[PDB]
Design an enzyme around this catalytic site. Structure first.
Site, mmCIF file in Angstrom:
data_model
loop_
_atom_site.group_PDB
_atom_site.id
_atom_site.type_symbol
_atom_site.label_atom_id
_atom_site.label_comp_id
_atom_site.label_asym_id
_atom_site.label_seq_id
_atom_site.Cartn_x
_atom_site.Cartn_y
_atom_site.Cartn_z
ATOM 1 N N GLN E 11 59.910 48.566 63.780
ATOM 2 C CA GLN E 11 58.530 48.305 64.176
ATOM 3 C C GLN E 11 57.892 47.187 63.365
ATOM 4 O O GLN E 11 56.969 46.534 63.859
ATOM 5 C CB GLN E 11 57.645 49.548 64.021
ATOM 6 C CG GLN E 11 57.503 50.036 62.583
ATOM 7 C CD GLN E 11 58.660 50.889 62.115
ATOM 8 O OE1 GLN E 11 59.807 50.664 62.491
ATOM 9 N NE2 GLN E 11 58.367 51.831 61.219
ATOM 10 N N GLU E 71 61.471 53.832 67.080
ATOM 11 C CA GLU E 71 60.270 54.611 67.333
ATOM 12 C C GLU E 71 59.516 54.031 68.518
ATOM 13 O O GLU E 71 59.086 52.868 68.473
ATOM 14 C CB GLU E 71 59.388 54.656 66.087
ATOM 15 C CG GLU E 71 60.064 55.391 64.934
ATOM 16 C CD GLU E 71 60.865 54.479 64.020
ATOM 17 O OE1 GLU E 71 61.302 53.400 64.471
ATOM 18 O OE2 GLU E 71 61.108 54.875 62.863
ATOM 19 N N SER E 140 63.557 43.353 57.350
ATOM 20 C CA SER E 140 62.789 43.517 56.127
ATOM 21 C C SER E 140 63.584 44.350 55.133
ATOM 22 O O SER E 140 64.291 45.288 55.511
ATOM 23 C CB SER E 140 61.432 44.178 56.398
ATOM 24 O OG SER E 140 61.587 45.542 56.739
ATOM 25 N N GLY E 144 61.937 50.821 56.796
ATOM 26 C CA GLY E 144 62.219 52.212 57.079
ATOM 27 C C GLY E 144 63.354 52.350 58.073
ATOM 28 O O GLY E 144 64.238 53.192 57.895
ATOM 29 N N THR E 145 63.350 51.532 59.126
ATOM 30 C CA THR E 145 64.515 51.455 60.000
ATOM 31 C C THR E 145 65.167 50.081 59.983
ATOM 32 O O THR E 145 66.319 49.948 60.409
ATOM 33 C CB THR E 145 64.150 51.818 61.445
ATOM 34 O OG1 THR E 145 63.288 50.818 62.003
ATOM 35 C CG2 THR E 145 63.477 53.180 61.507
ATOM 36 N N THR E 179 54.318 49.596 49.172
ATOM 37 C CA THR E 179 53.942 50.543 50.210
ATOM 38 C C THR E 179 54.838 51.773 50.233
ATOM 39 O O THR E 179 54.501 52.757 50.902
ATOM 40 C CB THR E 179 53.968 49.867 51.585
ATOM 41 O OG1 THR E 179 55.319 49.540 51.935
ATOM 42 C CG2 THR E 179 53.133 48.597 51.562
ATOM 43 N N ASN E 206 54.075 38.604 51.541
ATOM 44 C CA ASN E 206 52.809 38.726 52.258
ATOM 45 C C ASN E 206 51.608 38.327 51.411
ATOM 46 O O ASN E 206 50.660 37.732 51.938
ATOM 47 C CB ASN E 206 52.621 40.161 52.748
ATOM 48 C CG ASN E 206 52.640 41.166 51.614
ATOM 49 O OD1 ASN E 206 53.440 41.058 50.685
ATOM 50 N ND2 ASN E 206 51.749 42.148 51.681
ATOM 51 N N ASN E 228 51.409 36.831 61.619
ATOM 52 C CA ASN E 228 52.572 36.618 62.475
ATOM 53 C C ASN E 228 52.562 35.221 63.085
ATOM 54 O O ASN E 228 53.624 34.628 63.311
ATOM 55 C CB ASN E 228 52.622 37.687 63.565
ATOM 56 C CG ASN E 228 52.428 39.083 63.014
ATOM 57 O OD1 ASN E 228 52.618 39.326 61.822
ATOM 58 N ND2 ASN E 228 52.029 40.008 63.877
ATOM 59 N N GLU E 254 74.314 22.161 59.605
ATOM 60 C CA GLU E 254 73.979 21.289 58.483
ATOM 61 C C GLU E 254 73.122 22.010 57.444
ATOM 62 O O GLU E 254 73.286 21.791 56.239
ATOM 63 C CB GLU E 254 73.282 20.016 58.975
ATOM 64 C CG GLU E 254 74.139 19.049 59.816
ATOM 65 C CD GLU E 254 74.589 19.619 61.147
ATOM 66 O OE1 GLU E 254 74.011 20.632 61.586
ATOM 67 O OE2 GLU E 254 75.528 19.059 61.752
HETATM 68 N N1 LIG Z 1 57.659 42.808 59.301
HETATM 69 C C1 LIG Z 1 56.446 43.351 59.193
HETATM 70 N N2 LIG Z 1 56.141 44.180 58.139
HETATM 71 C C2 LIG Z 1 54.915 44.736 58.030
HETATM 72 C C3 LIG Z 1 53.913 44.500 58.963
HETATM 73 N N3 LIG Z 1 52.817 45.210 58.521
HETATM 74 C C4 LIG Z 1 53.142 45.872 57.368
HETATM 75 N N4 LIG Z 1 54.447 45.570 57.060
HETATM 76 C C5 LIG Z 1 55.324 45.990 55.945
HETATM 77 O O1 LIG Z 1 56.585 46.333 56.502
HETATM 78 C C6 LIG Z 1 57.032 47.613 56.084
HETATM 79 C C7 LIG Z 1 57.581 48.381 57.283
HETATM 80 O O2 LIG Z 1 58.890 48.821 56.999
HETATM 81 P P1 LIG Z 1 59.454 50.233 57.533
HETATM 82 O O3 LIG Z 1 58.368 51.266 57.418
HETATM 83 O O4 LIG Z 1 60.658 50.626 56.727
HETATM 84 O O5 LIG Z 1 59.820 50.028 59.086
HETATM 85 P P2 LIG Z 1 61.150 50.571 59.825
HETATM 86 O O6 LIG Z 1 62.366 50.705 58.959
HETATM 87 O O7 LIG Z 1 61.524 49.573 60.880
HETATM 88 O O8 LIG Z 1 60.848 52.025 60.462
HETATM 89 P P3 LIG Z 1 59.571 52.955 60.131
HETATM 90 O O9 LIG Z 1 59.857 53.863 58.939
HETATM 91 O O10 LIG Z 1 59.308 53.829 61.335
HETATM 92 O O11 LIG Z 1 58.349 52.084 59.946
HETATM 93 C C8 LIG Z 1 55.865 48.327 55.428
HETATM 94 O O12 LIG Z 1 56.284 48.835 54.176
HETATM 95 C C9 LIG Z 1 54.810 47.250 55.269
HETATM 96 O O13 LIG Z 1 54.633 47.037 53.896
HETATM 97 C C10 LIG Z 1 54.224 43.652 60.060
HETATM 98 O O14 LIG Z 1 53.454 43.342 60.978
HETATM 99 N N5 LIG Z 1 55.487 43.097 60.147
#
Ligand SMILES: Nc1nc2c(ncn2[C@@H]2O[C@H](COP(=O)(O)OP(=O)(O)OP(=O)(O)O)[C@@H](O)[C@H]2O)c(=O)[nH]1
Ligand SMILES: Nc1nc2c(ncn2[C@@H]2O[C@H](COP(=O)(O)OP(=O)(O)OP(=O)(O)O)[C@@H](O)[C@H]2O)c(=O)[nH]1
Lengths: 49, 427, 49, 36, 438
Positions: E11, E71, E140, E144-145, E179, E206, E228, E254
């Site tokens: 997400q 999710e 990232s 989380g996922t 976070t 960020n 974004n 390159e």
């Molecule tokens: N890439 C991105 N990161 C964000 C955004 N807003 C907040 N974040 C940061 O990105 C992190 C989200 O990572 P996760 O929570 O591990 O996401 P995930 O592994 O894909 O799955 P979830 O646990 O359901 O969220 C948070 O810790 C925020 O600090 C955004 O718009 N884009």
């Protein structure tokens, strides 16, 4: 198909030299994959009589 | 008769020639469509040295386009004179380059050398008897050096009896953009020194300095630089294609510049360079042309030969001149700087007189120089290799391809031999 | 000047019957041309015995 | 004059852009000589 | 031809991918429906979109990117969005369960029966592609996922496809903002797994993005919309070479050759110089000189590193817009003359220039400026090891007392991998130090 190629003499609105250096295949291409579909297909005189 | 076949390699040589053929065509006056507008008998006369005949009065350029990347050729074919250029001559690879010398010299070349060899011999059989071949590419070019090194090797055994003209641009000394660029230099110039007989050396920084000095137009195009060098290559080729009591054959020239085999690197010299007001402020007279001909500022090739001396000097003159102003002018310069020549050979001037002036200016010339000024050139790169071969930067790419540092050992050893060779002959 | 230049340029002025359609020179000169004689048209009347 | 690029295509010229567009001189007119 | 395929995991990585495509459709003029106006641009799929979109006989531009998430909330929301009609529903890969920020949960529990699905998508995209230079991976560390799920994916695409490039893009964890305190654990779990397989990973933070927002963009209260959009501009600039042309054209091949010095480290820094507010652009000047000064000004980089505490190896500038070599080559020469910039003596030259006459356009309802000369600065320095140095000390404290371990071991994992990864960073840091030793 016979009507198109033989009778209809193929697609009129098409541009004749629609075949030249293209993109992906950087060569003579964009000529015909579309093929004509327009104009009355089923309109010979025996039907009306 | 005796003809010329060209090869364009490297993406620079793509831009180099494309300006260069349009220079030739407009000089001969052919329209962009290809229907020649008959105006000069002599240009209709000796067009066969470079062009063959198609149906309807269209003169095909006898040159073959080779590349790997679409976009560079995509421009030139969409360019003004791509229609006169042959899709048959457009050979290319289905892969990217990566600006990696080994890939183009071992990986990508293998499946393309077969096609290009079959091509070039087809035009070779089409024509009767060459003077030789000429190549537009870069020694600092990734794909240009990679392909050419292969082709120059293969063309040697195929036809070891012709002229191996090579036109390569030297990269900017201060910055090479490409960071692995010096590695490409070694891999190229090492093999170049054996296979080639002629080499032209060109640098863009001087072309920049030329722009500040005489162009004075602040913001040029690289095509302007293409136009400038095309004028230089055109001048030496005007010798062959045009009449006048001048002996033009490159071997007629090459034997006159080359005292010893290892002398392949030559510097060009061009004729009046003018500014915005100077056109109507200049009396077009034999002295000031020659004065401007021998100007360290009008130098454009690599660097200033003031640090060294002159091995040979050869300037060909285009315009309505006579045999005596050329005669007296050499005496003036001979007496001017007699000591800055080498005591090995006196009177190293090699002059040709072309009576057919250009289209746009009448009184012109071209100069080709072999001086003792190449030392700093390979000296400059020499510190780079001794530096960057001390810990082998960027090695894992080439070694993964199958490269070994042993190849580097002889390549530098060969050049350091040339370092002494150029040094010992003059010093 | 190509191979065989001098006469080819010179012959067109003496050969004053050029066809106008493309490639018809063979069609025009299918019967032949005047090669085995002088350019002048007439040498009769010579009562020379 | 921003004519230094001719292959570029913008969409909305009604909305003004920024920048200090440098004046343009000559490219091959220097290679030519003295019209009239 | 010249094309690539993008992947967007989690997400977190999906809203930014939407913005990029949203940005991308603007310069391509794509209407929300999926077709251009009556103007003729359709065919066998051959124009500026052919490297990004697939406007086949159906006439609908098909973006070449896959959105993968576990999710359904956000992905179904964008499935109710504005451009969802363009987006392919099962290309919008969703999930029904979370990983609870557990890397292994997203790496073992659920990814097994989902990777096969996306592998079908990858191959079914692979067959239709022609040039397929590489992949655009958005993820990232604090995923989380994003962390666990993409890591196994990156392995499976590596084993089957090892001859092409894989471009990695992720937000780097904030040096002082956290976070999640499980975010640290998966971070090296990602790095140690990805060091031997990832081709090129480009990072960003960020906080500095926010710092830019109220410094020169003058926005004390932005949103992800701007966040974004800015990063979407960044990838747009580097992809403009695929889109448009210039004095010279450069490709990711390159970039990968000339940027990474040696194996392992492939972690350069990116920066875009003409980041400025609208009203400022009106009565101020842009030229190569000051933007070169600005891009090399230490506070303009988006990662918390001090260049005077490190040393440079490579620098890539992608001048997007109308510039000439003269001022550019002169300015960089003046840059080389500078004494404060401590490039390693190992590199006499480290500057990779990409010229593109296209200047970036503004976006409707945007906050950027009206730029004519733009440049993206890609560089790698030794001032980055402090980040991993900032990493390890929070970890050795956490691992010394085994926090949250019952969670990770409860689902079937153990400490050996955690033990394994720590010396990899120890291997990474001395590598950074040893190469720093000239
Ligand atoms: N890439 C991105 N990161 C964000 C955004 N807003 C907040 N974040 C940061 O990105 C992190 C989200 O990572 P996760 O929570 O591990 O996401 P995930 O592994 O894909 O799955 P979830 O646990 O359901 O969220 C948070 O810790 C925020 O600090 C955004 O718009 N884009
Ligand atoms: N066409 C072109 N080439 C330039 C220009 N300025 C410098 N060059 C150099 O000319 C060289 C020759 O081009 P190519 O031999 O075709 O390049 P390549 O083999 O495809 O690989 P690279 O050299 O890495 O680009 C390049 O390496 C450039 O560094 C320019 O303005 N136009």
């Amino acid at each position: 198909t016979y009507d198109d190629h033989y009778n209809r003499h193929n697609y009129n609105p098409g541009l004749p030299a629609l075949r030249t250096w293209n993109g992906q295949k950087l060569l003579w291409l964009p000529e015909k994959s579309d093929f004509p579909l327009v104009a009355p297909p089923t309109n010979y005189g025996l039907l009306e009589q | 008769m005796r003809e010329i076949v060209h090869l364009q390699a490297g993406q620079c040589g793509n831009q180099i020639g494309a300006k260069f053929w349009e220079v030739i065509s407009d000089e001969h006056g052919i329209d962009p469509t290809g229907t020649y507008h008959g105006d000069s008998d002599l240009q209709l006369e000796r067009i066969n040295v470079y062009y063959n005949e198609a149906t309807g009065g269209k003169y095909v350029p006898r040159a073959v386009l080779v590349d790997l990347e679409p976009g560079t050729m995509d421009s030139v074919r969409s360019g003004p004179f791509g229609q006169i250029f042959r899709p048959d001559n457009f050979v290319f690879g289905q892969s990217g380059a990566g600006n990696n010398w080994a890939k183009g010299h071992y990986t990508e070349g293998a499946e393309l050398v077969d096609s290009v060899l079959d091509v070039v011999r087809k035009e070779a059989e089409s024509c009767d008897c060459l003077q030789g071949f000429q190549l537009t590419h870069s020694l600092g070019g990734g794909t240009g050096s990679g392909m050419g090194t292969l082709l120059i090797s293969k063309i040697r055994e195929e036809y070891p009896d012709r002229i191996m003209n090579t036109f390569s641009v030297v990269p900017s000394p201060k910055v090479s953009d490409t960071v692995v660029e010096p590695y490409n230099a070694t891999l190229s110039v090492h093999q170049l020194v054996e296979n080639t007989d002629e080499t032209y050396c060109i640098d863009n920084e001087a072309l920049y300095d030329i722009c500040f000095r005489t162009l004075k137009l602040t913001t040029p195009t690289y095509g302007d630089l293409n136009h400038l060098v095309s004028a230089t290559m055109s001048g030496v080729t005007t010798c062959l294609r045009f009449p006048g009591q001048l002996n033009a054959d490159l071997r007629k020239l090459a034997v006159n510049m080359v005292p010893f085999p290892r002398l392949h690197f030559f510097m060009p010299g061009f004729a009046p360079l003018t500014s915005r007001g100077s056109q109507q402020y200049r009396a077009l007279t034999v002295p000031e042309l020659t004065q401007q001909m021998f100007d360290a500022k009008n130098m454009m090739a690599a660097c200033d030969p003031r640090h060294g001396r002159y091995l040979t000097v050869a300037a060909v003159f285009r315009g309505r001149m006579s045999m005596k102003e050329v005669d007296e002018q050499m005496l003036n310069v001979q007496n001017k700087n007699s000591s800055y020549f080498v005591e090995w050979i006196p009177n190293n001037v090699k002059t040709a007189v072309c009576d057919i002036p250009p289209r746009g200016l009448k009184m012109s010339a071209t100069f080709i120089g072999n001086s003792t000024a190449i030392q700093e050139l390979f000296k400059r790169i020499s510190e780079q290799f001794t530096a960057m071969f001390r810990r082998k930067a960027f090695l894992h790419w080439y070694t993964g391809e199958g490269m070994d540092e042993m190849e580097f050992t002889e390549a530098e050893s060969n050049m350091n031999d040339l370092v002494s060779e150029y040094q010992q002959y003059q010093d | 000047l190509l191979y065989n230049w001098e006469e080819e340029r010179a012959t067109n002025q003496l050969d004053q019957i050029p066809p106008l359609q493309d490639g018809s020179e063979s069609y025009f000169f299918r019967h032949g041309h005047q090669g085995l004689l002088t350019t002048q048209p007439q040498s009769p009347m010579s009562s020379s015995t | 004059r921003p004519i230094y690029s001719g292959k570029f295509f913008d969409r909305v010229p009604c909305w003004p852009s920024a920048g200090k567009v440098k004046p343009v001189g000559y490219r091959v007119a220097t290679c030519l000589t003295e019209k009239l | 031809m010249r094309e690539c395929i993008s992947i967007h995991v989690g997400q977190a990585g999906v809203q930014i991918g939407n913005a990029c495509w949203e940005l991308y459709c603007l310069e391509h003029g794509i209407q929300p429906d999926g077709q251009m106006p009556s103007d003729k641009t359709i065919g066998g799929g051959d124009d500026s979109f052919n490297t990004f979109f697939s406007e086949t006989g159906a006439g609908k531009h098909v973006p070449r990117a896959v959105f993968v998430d576990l999710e359904p909330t956000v992905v179904d929301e964008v499935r109710t969005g504005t451009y969802r009609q363009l987006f392919h529903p099962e290309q919008l890969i969703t999930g029904k369960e979370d990983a609870a920020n557990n890397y292994a949960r997203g790496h073992y529990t659920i990814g097994k029966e989902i990777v096969d699905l996306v592998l079908d998508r990858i191959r079914k995209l692979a067959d239709l592609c022609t040039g397929l230079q590489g992949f655009l991976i958005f993820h990232s560390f604090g995923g989380g996922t994003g962390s666990g799920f993409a890591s196994l994916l990156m392995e499976r695409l590596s084993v089957d496809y090892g001859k092409k490039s894989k471009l990695e893009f992720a937000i780097y964890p904030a040096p002082q903002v956290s976070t999640a305190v499980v975010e640290p654990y998966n971070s090296i779990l990602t790095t140690h797994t990805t060091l031997e397989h990832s081709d090129c990973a480009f990072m960003v933070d960020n906080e500095a993005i926010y710092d830019i927002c109220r410094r020169n963009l003058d926005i004390e209260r932005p949103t992800y919309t701007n966040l974004n959009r800015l990063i979407g501009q960044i990838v747009s600039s580097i992809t403009a070479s695929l889109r448009f042309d210039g004095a010279l054209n450069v490709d990711l091949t390159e970039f990968q050759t000339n940027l990474v010095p040696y194996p392992r480290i492939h972690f350069p820094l990116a920066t875009y110089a003409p980041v400025i507010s609208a009203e400022k652009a009106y009565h101020e000047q842009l030229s190569v000189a000051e933007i070169t000064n600005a891009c090399f000004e230490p506070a303009n980089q988006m990662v918390k590193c001090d260049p005077r505490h490190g040393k440079y190896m490579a620098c890539c500038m992608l001048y997007r817009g109308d510039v000439v070599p003269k001022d550019v080559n002169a300015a960089i020469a003046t840059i080389k003359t500078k004494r404060t910039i401590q490039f390693v003596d190992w590199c006499p030259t480290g500057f990779k220039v990409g010229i593109n006459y296209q200047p970036p356009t503004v976006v409707p309802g945007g906050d950027l400026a009206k730029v004519q000369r733009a440049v993206c600065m890609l560089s790698n320095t030794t001032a980055i090891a402090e980040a991993w140095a900032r990493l390890d000390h929070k970890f050795d404290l956490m691992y010394a007392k085994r926090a949250f371990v019952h969670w990770y071991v409860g689902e079937g994992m153990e400490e050996g991998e955690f033990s394994e990864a720590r010396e990899d960073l120890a291997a990474l840091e001395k590598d950074y130090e040893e190469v720093g030793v000239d």
